[PDB]
Amino acid sequence: VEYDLKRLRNIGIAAHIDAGKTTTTERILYYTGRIHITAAVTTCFWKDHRINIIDAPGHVDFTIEVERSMRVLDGAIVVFDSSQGVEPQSETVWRQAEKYKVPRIAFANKMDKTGADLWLVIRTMQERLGARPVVMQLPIGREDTFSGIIDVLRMKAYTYGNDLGTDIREIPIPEEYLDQAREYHEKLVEVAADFDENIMLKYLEGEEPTEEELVAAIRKGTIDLKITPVFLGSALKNKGVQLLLDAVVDYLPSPLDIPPIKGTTPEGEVVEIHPDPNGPLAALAFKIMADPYVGRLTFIRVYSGTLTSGSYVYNTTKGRKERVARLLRMHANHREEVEELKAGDLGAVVGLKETITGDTLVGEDAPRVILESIEVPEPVIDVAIEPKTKADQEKLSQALARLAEEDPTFRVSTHPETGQTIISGMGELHLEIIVDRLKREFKVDANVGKPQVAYRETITKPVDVEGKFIRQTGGRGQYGHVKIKVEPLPRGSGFEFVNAIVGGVIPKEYIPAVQKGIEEAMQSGPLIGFPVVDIKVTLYDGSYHEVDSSEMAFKIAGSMAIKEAVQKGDPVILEPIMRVEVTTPEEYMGDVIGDLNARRGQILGMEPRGNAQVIRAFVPLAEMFGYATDLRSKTQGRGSFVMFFDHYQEVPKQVQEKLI
Ligand SMILES: Nc1nc2c(ncn2[C@@H]2O[C@H](COP(=O)(O)OP(=O)(O)CP(=O)(O)O)[C@@H](O)[C@H]2O)c(=O)[nH]1
Numbered sequence: 001v002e003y004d005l006k007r008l009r010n011i012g013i014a015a016h017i018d019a020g021k022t023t024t025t026e027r028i029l030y031y032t033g034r035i036h037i038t039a040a041v042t043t044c045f046w047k048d049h050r051i052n053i054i055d056a057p058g059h060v061d062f063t064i065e066v067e068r069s070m071r072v073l074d075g076a077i078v079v080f081d082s083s084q085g086v087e088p089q090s091e092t093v094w095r096q097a098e099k100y101k102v103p104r105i106a107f108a109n110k111m112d113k114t115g116a117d118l119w120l121v122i123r124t125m126q127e128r129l130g131a132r133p134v135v136m137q138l139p140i141g142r143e144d145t146f147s148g149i150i151d152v153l154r155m156k157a158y159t160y161g162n163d164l165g166t167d168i169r170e171i172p173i174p175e176e177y178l179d180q181a182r183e184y185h186e187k188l189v190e191v192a193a194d195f196d197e198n199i200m201l202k203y204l205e206g207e208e209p210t211e212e213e214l215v216a217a218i219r220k221g222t223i224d225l226k227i228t229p230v231f232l233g234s235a236l237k238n239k240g241v242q243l244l245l246d247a248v249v250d251y252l253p254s255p256l257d258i259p260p261i262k263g264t265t266p267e268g269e270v271v272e273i274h275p276d277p278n279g280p281l282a283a284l285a286f287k288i289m290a291d292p293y294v295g296r297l298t299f300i301r302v303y304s305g306t307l308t309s310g311s312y313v314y315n316t317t318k319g320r321k322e323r324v325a326r327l328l329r330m331h332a333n334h335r336e337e338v339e340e341l342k343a344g345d346l347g348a349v350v351g352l353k354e355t356i357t358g359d360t361l362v363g364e365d366a367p368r369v370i371l372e373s374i375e376v377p378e379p380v381i382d383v384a385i386e387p388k389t390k391a392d393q394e395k396l397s398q399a400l401a402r403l404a405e406e407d408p409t410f411r412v413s414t415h416p417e418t419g420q421t422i423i424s425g426m427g428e429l430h431l432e433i434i435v436d437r438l439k440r441e442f443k444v445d446a447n448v449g450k451p452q453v454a455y456r457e458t459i460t461k462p463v464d465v466e467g468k469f470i471r472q473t474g475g476r477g478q479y480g481h482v483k484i485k486v487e488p489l490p491r492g493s494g495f496e497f498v499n500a501i502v503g504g505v506i507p508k509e510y511i512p513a514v515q516k517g518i519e520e521a522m523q524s525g526p527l528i529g530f531p532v533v534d535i536k537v538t539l540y541d542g543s544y545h546e547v548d549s550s551e552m553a554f555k556i557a558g559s560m561a562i563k564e565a566v567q568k569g570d571p572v573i574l575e576p577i578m579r580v581e582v583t584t585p586e587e588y589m590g591d592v593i594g595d596l597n598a599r600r601g602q603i604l605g606m607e608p609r610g611n612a613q614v615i616r617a618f619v620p621l622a623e624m625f626g627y628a629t630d631l632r633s634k635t636q637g638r639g640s641f642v643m644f645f646d647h648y649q650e651v652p653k654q655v656q657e658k659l660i
């Protein structure tokens with residue numbers, strides 16, 4: 001175990017679509033892999049430092065896998081496409097880094113492409129992002145003549161012979177560039193002066209400081225979220241990627257340099273878990289992969305203590321033992337088996353049958369802390385799915401079971417009378433990618449209906465009703481007779497059944513049958529056909545025919561009673577109420593407030609984050625369809641939002657008629 005905590009670097013590459021996120025990653029692994037695919041975490045070496053490239057989801061609108069991966073990584077490279085400029089959503093990726101207090105460096109990719117303006121990037125970081133950038137390098141040559149890069153801090157430059165990254169020469173700075181470099185070098189020192197008194201008192205005195213001095217201060221400013229170093233080049237034309245690697249080991253934080261992850265005890269106490277390898281074990285799980293030839297892989301981040309291969313861990317979320325079989329590190333083109341993962345590092349475990357993405361793993365004798373929050377988010381959006389021709393069906397109902405493992409947060413059901421296949425999840429985007437991950441990945445071709453909000457039904461007042469089923473059906477006679485007392489149950493409390501049968505008035509056998517009929521009618525309410533919730537059912541009386549009584553009779557009899565009940569109890573539709581934090585440029589505040597209220601929303605409060613304003617608001621899910629458009633239409637593309645389920649609500653009286 002050649003593990004040093006200080007010389008460890010956990011990175012994530014964040015970028016707007018088309019910036020060079022994948023290309024840069026590809027090149028990064030290549031240059032590091034020259035001594036003697038994807039996958040959640042990938043490891044490599046540069047200048048005696050371990051770099052763990054935490055794989056961006058990506059696609060930034062799934063704000064569950066983002067918050068999770070932001071806690072896993074420590075520093076980020078934010079990649080900009082310097083061709084088009086800085087487009088709308090490029091802001092969104094920046095706001096995320098701000099949200100999770102993660103130190104960052106910028107990388108202006110595509111200095112080779114026509115339209116490559118370095119400065120358009122720098123200025124838009126100052127203005128829109130509010131990033132206070134510090135210029136670390138300057139280009140040599142324009143677009144297609146882009147052939148060198150100057151490092152202004154050390155005052156040296158690099159010419160590139162080809163575009164394959166196989167000829168790199170350290171040259172003295174061209175005369176045509178020496179003045180501009182000197183300007184920006186002086187500028188750089190000035191920035192360092194804000195973070196070192198020693199640098200300050202030298203910068204006043206006229207004396208040029210040492211590299212160790214500047215590097216240390218410019219690094220201090222980065223980890224403290226005050227400045228953002230900017231680097232450039234062409235990832236495609238293999239220019240400046242090695243210098244980007246150097247920047248990673250220089251200015252980006254090690255696990256020692258950041259604020260300690262906060263977890264919760266089983267009592268609700270808030271603890272700061274310290275990154276000590278000798279202390280108790282606490283580790284997060286964040287990706288469950290299916291691997292062709294090892295089995296299930298579950299990717300972990302270790303925060304304190306040591307995860308040792310071939311041992312046991314305690315799963316605070318599920319409350320059970322788990323056997324850690326083997327441990328692995330993922331490299332560019334091979335797998336490495338390891339004996340232990342210590343505090344601050346990352347890899348993937350083998351085995352771990354019962355663990356799901358988002359769970360915590362402690363060291364058996366260790367404090368029973370939880371890293372994430374407890375509750376399970378509800379299924380709120382329904383989508384109908386119809387398989388083409390038999391062959392796709394049998395491998396669709398197979399495709400879903402063979403996928404309800406890495407993501408158990410989606411539910412599958414069958415619609416009461418249409419007999420289709422209904423899939424439900426956490427929102428639109430959650431489901432719209434599951435559909436795609438079936439036609440391409442699992443190769444199932446079928447038709448998909450337009451997303452629809454999952455409503456619920458319930459009574460407002462207590463009633464007392466009876467259901468009978470006396471008919472001559474299929475040669476024989478049928479008799480079932482039940483008398484129930486139903487009342488409303490506090491919100492979120494669900495179902496409750498009570499038996500209060502006195503004198504074998506309804507014989508022992510037929511009691512399960514009555515329950516089964518109740519449930520089935522509780523699937524399809526008498527307002528819109530959505531499931532009935534939050535009620536207490538009480539079976540107190542009834543009757544039976546000595547010979548005509550049957551399970552089927554008391555099933556239908558129980559069904560007829562509960563439909564009659566939910567009808568008489570002054571029913572009411574329930575809609576999900578979402579919780580929305582909306583990040584917006586300070587200026588366009590009024591025009592977003594004066595829109596959430598038009599969505600029947602209620603404002604909770606606005607507090608600044610960075611140079612922008614985040615708004616917290618309660619809005620119904622039904623008034624959230626295609627918000628990503630309306631938002632970017634009223635913020636010139638600069639706005640962005642997140643969404644979480646909070647509770648269920650009794651719908652306003654005007655909305656009810658519109659739904660019935
Ligand atoms: N001219 C030029 N083109 C580049 C450079 N780096 C990447 N590209 C090109 O731009 C495109 C961006 O794709 P990619 O590298 O996957 O970016 P990405 O952000 O991963 C796209 P997504 O976010 O959808 O996965 C690619 O087609 C790539 O060939 C560069 O340095 N210069």
Ligand SMILES: [Mg+2]
Pocket residue numbers: 021022058
């Ligand atoms: Mg990609």
